[PDB]
Design a protein around this ligand. Sequence first.
Ligand SMILES: NC(=O)[C@H]1CCCN(C(=O)Cc2ncc3ccc(Br)cn23)C1
Ligand SMILES: [Zn+2]
Length: 139
Amino acid sequence: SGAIYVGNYRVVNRHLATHNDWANLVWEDSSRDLLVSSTTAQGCDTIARCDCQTGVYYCSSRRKHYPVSFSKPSLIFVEASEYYPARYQSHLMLAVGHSEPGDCGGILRCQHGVVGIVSTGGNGLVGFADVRDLLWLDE
Ligand SMILES: NC(=O)[C@H]1CCCN(C(=O)Cc2ncc3ccc(Br)cn23)C1
Ligand SMILES: [Zn+2]
């Protein structure tokens, strides 16, 4: 679990969005596993606007942060789950690092700010949904 709080927005994994997120929907994209909802309070986070390919993510299943090298956002095949049919997830970045079911929502950050959130993984890999291209989050 986990979310990004920037301005009057809350960014969460679309498959983990609550009834309240859907009632305050701003934008959602099943192909990216992202959903953005509006908030009444001002958020605590800053979004990176860069092309960094190294950073640090939070891994809830270890209660620890790990440094990673990740691939640029791209279209990657994701096998069927209880949440989605088998499909290509877009804007996804992969890294070698631990992750297990329950780790979605952990933040990935570089020196410029928030880069993305954990969205898939397995077998010693971790996949992150990028948010750096969502320029409208800053207004
Ligand atoms: N983005 C998606 O389609 C995910 C939706 C929830 C379901 N998806 C998964 O990957 C579930 C899953 N099985 C093994 C692992 C290991 C690490 C992580 Br993080 C998640 N994991 C796929
Ligand atoms: Zn950066």
